[PDB]
Design an enzyme around this catalytic site. Sequence first.
Site, short mmCIF file in Angstrom:
data_model
loop_
_atom_site.label_atom_id
_atom_site.label_comp_id
_atom_site.label_asym_id
_atom_site.label_seq_id
_atom_site.Cartn_x
_atom_site.Cartn_y
_atom_site.Cartn_z
N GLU A 1 0.89 -1.13 -0.08
CA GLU A 1 -0.08 0.04 0.08
C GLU A 1 1.04 1.05 -0.15
O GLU A 1 0.35 2.16 -0.67
CB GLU A 1 -1.00 0.18 1.24
CG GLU A 1 -2.04 -1.08 1.25
CD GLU A 1 -2.74 -1.19 -0.11
OE1 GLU A 1 -2.89 -0.24 -0.76
OE2 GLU A 1 -3.15 -2.13 -0.52
N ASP B 1 29.79 -28.36 -4.06
CA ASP B 1 29.67 -27.23 -4.49
C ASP B 1 30.21 -26.92 -5.91
O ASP B 1 31.30 -27.53 -6.17
CB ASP B 1 29.98 -25.88 -3.66
CG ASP B 1 29.24 -26.31 -2.12
OD1 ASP B 1 28.05 -26.29 -2.10
OD2 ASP B 1 30.07 -26.18 -1.18
N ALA C 1 29.99 -26.96 3.32
CA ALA C 1 30.04 -28.24 3.37
C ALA C 1 29.41 -28.66 2.08
O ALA C 1 28.94 -27.76 1.44
CB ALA C 1 29.26 -28.88 4.77
CA LIG Z 1 27.72 -25.79 0.26
CA LIG Z 2 32.05 -27.74 -0.26
#
Ligand SMILES: [Ca+2]
Ligand SMILES: [Ca+2]
Length: 453
Positions: free
Chosen positions: A166, A343, A340
Amino acid sequence: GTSSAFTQIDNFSHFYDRGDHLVNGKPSFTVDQVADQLTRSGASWHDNDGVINLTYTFLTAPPVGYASRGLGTFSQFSALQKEQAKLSLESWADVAKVTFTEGPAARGDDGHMTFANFSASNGGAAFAYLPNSSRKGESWYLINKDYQVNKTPGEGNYGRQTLTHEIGHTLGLSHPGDNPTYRDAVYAEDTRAYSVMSYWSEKNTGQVFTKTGEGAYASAPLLDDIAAVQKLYGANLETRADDTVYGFNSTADRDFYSATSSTDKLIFSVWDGGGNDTLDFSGFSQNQKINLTAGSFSDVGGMTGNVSIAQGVTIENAIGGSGNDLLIGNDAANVLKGGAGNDIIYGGGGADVLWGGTGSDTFVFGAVSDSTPKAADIIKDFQSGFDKIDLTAITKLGGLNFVDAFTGHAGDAIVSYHQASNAGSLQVDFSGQGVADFLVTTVGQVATYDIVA
Ligand SMILES: [Ca+2]
Ligand SMILES: [Ca+2]
Ligand SMILES: [Ca+2]
Ligand SMILES: [Ca+2]
Ligand SMILES: [Ca+2]
Ligand SMILES: [Ca+2]
């Protein structure tokens, strides 16, 4: 061809691309095209100091003529609504050169806003007026036994987003288009993944923020909202101009930019005026895809297309969670940390600092210019036999010729190690000039078998 790792990076970098194509049968509009769309009414507050200074009041009594609006019983905003309203106001002031000060209309201000509740459902859930109307600055919110959404606005719920939405309208933002459904949208990105002004859910554009029975709504201006309001009033480059961390361990001092638990549902668009910033999504366990490209989207905290960086903003660092994430840098020198999980990290241009974290990480390079001798990336925790340096986007899988010294032949590559400093390096002469034109340094030994090319 290229590896799957590179393809995943490339695919994600382009996953939310906008403009010049149809999506859902509708034209895909770029952020700038939506900025025009959202400001198509031509209404705005007027300045001058180059800043719009508005005042606002939580009405304590119905205005003259109130009874004729058919809104039923008037009621003042509760403390909770005032608190949330101020946060919503602040989130707009954070991005555009508009300020909101609680107080009565004043000759020195550029306009005045009012906030209040009404009880008759017929008035609608909430509504507001454009700044060019006779009721400029006004926003009203329904509260009754049958509609309780506005009674407890809060970070992430529709009550807070309503306040934001709004106020956006009082600032001059139109709803994205004129039994309507997303099928009636003028452009593809007309959903609340891109703008809080949209009536349609993110599901229409494919994003997933939450599941049935649960509500998840961006509390602050999203990507296109930021573009639209800055188009009207100019970008506020003064906010968070120092180093800022968004997400976990946030230093942004905004409830919507803060995560403290793996279950948090972040839906935000990052605006920032400068500094060396970090998107810290380290507390999430789900697979994430973080893109540091300005104006781009990321899949964060187990959701998709929920985080973005506003146009004109340079974010330098990203930290993934324990999931198997993708991290995409930009042209600046980036610090990308995988956390961790397995990747895939793509630093892009500039000299980057890459941390794979624990797990089996892949450092992807899409161009020679990504990591040159004079501006080399460094992989701070390379684990031979587990991590990989992927050059397939460059070599197109043609392979490399690992030698001890460049022979002038293109594709020659040298893996070196300096035992004393535990420093490794991968040098490559892609052009075949007899000298390295590509260089990556590491902490930890790198072996020829850790290279994918
Ligand atoms: Ca990761
Ligand atoms: Ca990693
Ligand atoms: Ca900053
Ligand atoms: Ca920055
Ligand atoms: Ca970079
Ligand atoms: Ca780089």
